[PDB]
Amino acid sequence: MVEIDPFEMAVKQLERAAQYMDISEEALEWLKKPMRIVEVSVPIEMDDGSVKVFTGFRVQHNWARGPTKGGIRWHPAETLSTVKALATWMTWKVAVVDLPYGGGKGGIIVNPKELSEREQERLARAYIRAVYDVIGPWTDIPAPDVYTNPKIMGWMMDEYETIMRRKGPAFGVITGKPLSIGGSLGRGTATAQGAIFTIREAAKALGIDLKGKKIAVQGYGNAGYYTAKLAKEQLGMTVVAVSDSRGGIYNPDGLDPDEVLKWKREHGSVKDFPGATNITNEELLELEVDVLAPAAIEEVITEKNADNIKAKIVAEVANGPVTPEADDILREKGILQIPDFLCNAGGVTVSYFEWVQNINGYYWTEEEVREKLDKKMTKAFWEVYNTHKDKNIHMRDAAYVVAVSRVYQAMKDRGWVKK
């Protein structure tokens, strides 16, 4: 259902942004192709006793800066191109906030809503058994993503530890784990906290007081719900509309995120929430708000609605929710955009913190994680902002100049590319 191919779009963005920097042709060709792709068959036993084979992908795009990092997406509409694009974005995501990581991603073409608990556990364990040879605490560190949660992360960690015979830091093979089995404090609200920090910095740059303003959030998952909650709590914002895959609810007077979450859990969706009006995702994206945070499937803003966006700041919590064309239209409209791999870099940052805690065997507190995350996100955002201001270019491009250059430097320090 995607407007354009995700990997093609990602490559187009990379070229469009490399047009504003000095990079050799060979380095560009290296960066336009994932470094390793592994397609595996994942066989599991269903509840009725039959054996079903799913398709799994583990794509690492580059590991010049360090071990690759990226979540695992469970999605019926997933394609290898989507995983390649996500790994490519992961690379820039970890480069922009200066982490010793490369870019990676994983996925399974499956509808998890049709799978039971035992089937989900079997699927996670079989995926680990399939991709064990390309993952590790120093090779490839998976994490939670769309339709995956810390539960599945703990199952995957247990399977990896069983295969690995407890020879090294198995806890560090995967992030977003439960706190009991080597989890990190603040990882649950990581991406939301990073998005909130970036929104606050953007408002500071734009000279806008966020108290009493309006935020519309698309998607009510681990990122969308926590983003709405933190915006209502920390920034003093008024959440006027939320949504999920079945539709959204809008309220001019504001919504309480906890009640909406309870209604969603007790009914399966946020639709027909009391005191709110049912709308579509297309209608929510077009609402008159001060901040719009897409936290759902990619490619939600295209030439079919780019001119209808009326938000002062668009916080791309999701991975690649805006097309380059739509980026040009929004920039022509004077709308500030927080780039996708900079806005939601808080999640990968706290995942890096969890990995450090796991490999060192020493765990931090909430305050330390909160301070380090704030420091990293503020530095990265201000670097990207000053970059886009000095060169008079789009935000997305500027972050690329901040990110790709670092990656480029790594290759020149490894001898991968001579020029």
Ligand X SMILES: NC(=O)C1=CN([C@@H]2O[C@H](COP(=O)(O)OP(=O)(O)OC[C@H]3O[C@@H](n4cnc5c(N)ncnc54)[C@H](OP(=O)(O)O)[C@@H]3O)[C@@H](O)[C@H]2O)C=CC1
Ligand Y SMILES: O=C(O)CCC(=O)C(=O)O
The three-state (H, E, C) secondary structure of 63-110, written as one string: CCCCCEECCEEECCCCCHHHHHHHHHHHHHHHHHCCCCCEEEEEEECC
Footprint (CB under 6 A) of ligand X, residues 262-291 = 269, 281
Nearest-CB residue to ligand Y? 71
Binding mask 291-330 for ligand Y (x = CB under 6 A): ----------------------------x-----------
Which residue from 91, 191, 281, 337 is in contact with ligand [N+], where contact means CB under 6 A? 191
Where do the H-state alpha helices sit in 107-236? Answer: 117-131, 150-164, 190-206, 224-233
Token pair belonging to 288 = 């008159």
Residues β-bridged to residue 338: 315
Q: What is the DSSP-derived secondary structure letter of residue 181? A: T
Does 224 contact ligand X by CB under 6 A? yes
Cα distance between residue 241 and residue 250, in whole Å: 4
Q: Are 28 and 20 in contact (CB under 8 A)?
A: no
In the residue annotation, 412 being an active-site residue is answered as no
What's the closest the beta carbon of residue 94 comes to ligand Y, in angstroms?
8
Considering 69, 84, 105, 264, which one is annotated as catalytic? 105
Cα distance between residue 227 and residue 195, in whole Å: 7
Cα distance between residue 412 and residue 363, in whole Å: 35
Q: Are strands 51-62 and 102-108 parallel, antiparallel or unpaired?
A: antiparallel
Block residue for tokens 């093979």: 173
Does 113 contact ligand Y by CB under 6 A? yes
Q: Is 217 or 289 the residue whose CB approaches ligand Y more closely?
A: 217
Which residue from 137, 144, 257, 339 is in contact with ligand X, where contact means CB under 6 A? 144
Q: Is 306 or 417 the residue whose CB approaches ligand X more closely?
A: 306
245 contacts which partner out of ligand Y, ligand X, ligand [N+], none, CB within 5 to 8 A by kind? ligand X
Q: Is 290 or 298 the residue whose CB approaches ligand [N+] more closely?
A: 298
What's the closest the beta carbon of residue 390 comes to ligand Y, in angstroms?
27
Footprint (CB under 6 A) of ligand [N+], residues 44-103 = none
> Is residue 233 packed enough to be buried (19+ CB in 10 Å), middle (13-18) or exposed (0-12)?
exposed
Does 43 contact ligand Y by CB under 6 A? no
Cβ contacts of 239 within 8 Å, gap of 6 or more: 215, 216, 217, 228, 231, 232, 254, 255, 257
Which DSSP string corresponds to 12-40? HHHHHHHTTS---HHHHHHHTS-SEEEEE
Does 344 contact ligand [N+] by CB under 6 A? yes
- Choose among 393, 352, 338: nearest CA to 401: 393
- Candidates 75-83, 203-211, 341-349, 389-397: pick the segment binding ligand [N+] (CB under 6 A): 341-349
Does 221 contact ligand X by CB under 6 A? yes
Ligand-binding site membership of 361 (annotated): no
Give the footprint of ligand Y on this chain (CB under 6 A). Answer: 69-71, 93, 112-113, 143, 145, 147-149, 175, 221-222, 319, 344, 347-348, 351
Annotated binding site for NAD(+): 219-225
Annotated binding site: 219-225
Give the footprint of ligand X on this chain (CB under 6 A). Answer: 71, 144-147, 191, 218-224, 243-246, 269, 281, 295-297, 318-319, 344, 347
Which residues does the annotation mark as catalytic?
105
